[PDB]
Amino acid sequence: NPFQFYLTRVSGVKPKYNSGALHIKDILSPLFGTLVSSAQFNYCFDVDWLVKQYPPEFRKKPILLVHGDKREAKAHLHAQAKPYENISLCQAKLDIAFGTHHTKMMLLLYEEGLRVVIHTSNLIHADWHQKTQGIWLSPLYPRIADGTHKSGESPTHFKANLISYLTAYNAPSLKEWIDVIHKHDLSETNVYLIGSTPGRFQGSQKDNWGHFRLKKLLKDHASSMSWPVVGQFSSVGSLGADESKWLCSEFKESMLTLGVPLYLIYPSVENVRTSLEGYPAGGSLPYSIQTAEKQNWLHSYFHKWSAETSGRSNAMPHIKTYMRPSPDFSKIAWFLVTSANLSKAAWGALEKNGTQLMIRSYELGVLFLPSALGLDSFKVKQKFATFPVPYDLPPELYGSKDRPWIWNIPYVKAPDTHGNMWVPS
């Protein structure tokens, strides 16, 4: 199977729905390789939990935690890590306000080679318990032979692009990981890397990151042929006073590039209320009333979470995906799984009369293009050549009584799955 795209295991659904699914313990298992060292890029971490996901025999190998925490939060993370002598930390610079280090990636160095995992889950128990999350698993990349002259590069330029992404951190502990990547053969890679890093990018540099990076790839490696754009995410930034300020101007413009209906998928209150977790699923859907009230126009694009295809309608999404289905939703021109939510912070916004792209955050995703497999389009696998779309198509519009889940207002009129109400404060 050419995609190597997986969902995480969900507790409390029938076993058949977890058969092709992966838990972090599966990923770190000895069947995947004899572990020597690892790097864990993420946003939230529970270190005690994380160490327990490694198999006992690998639990004392060096682990590098790449995080964005500052001040007190940084002090607390160092304190959780201290007991574990084998753990080092790298604080990613966040020079721009309201930026986060949001990338979820594992670099796994083995005796037998190197693996890269790009995924959507925080390193905390609740992200891997009852949520819909996505994982891309690289192949086992072998070491380049001791006396040989090869680039180890793929046709998608994945090796160079990943080194460029790590190089932007300007961090000593990542230079060692960059050197490790240099030494391995990543030529089998069939996905394109799409990254965001904090900065203001001018001229040629605009194409390197965020939605301009996606636009550049779609221009160069997709062919044109009414095909909608679908975006599916778990956090929503401040998008502006109306659809023309960013969403439908620069953002949709990048997404529809090749060589238009826009569907946005985001859980309603009813989706959350009746989920496996109930209202506490909302702790991972942090759309605030302060943001929502500025942009009620956005909610007309909102569609329900529905995932009968993967038995996950009650497993709230923390995966983020973007794609370009045909008018009948039976094929797609491309698919993207990423850490990037629907925000300018993650995707970039144009500044200074459109000569500057400003990005607040670190994000990372992988783009699946038919051309990378010698195809023109992918057929959609109707039941999770054939791409496994993890949710139902076509997406269903919010009903007249539906509202977007907003995490910081109370819900006290109907109890959730576990008989509880939601009263933040």
């Binding site: 939230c44 971490f45 529970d46 925080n122 905390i124 702790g283 991972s284 942090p286």
Partner: peptide, 6 residues
Amino acid sequence: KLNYYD
């Protein structure tokens, strides 16, 4: 950071 709300 242990989760989104701290």
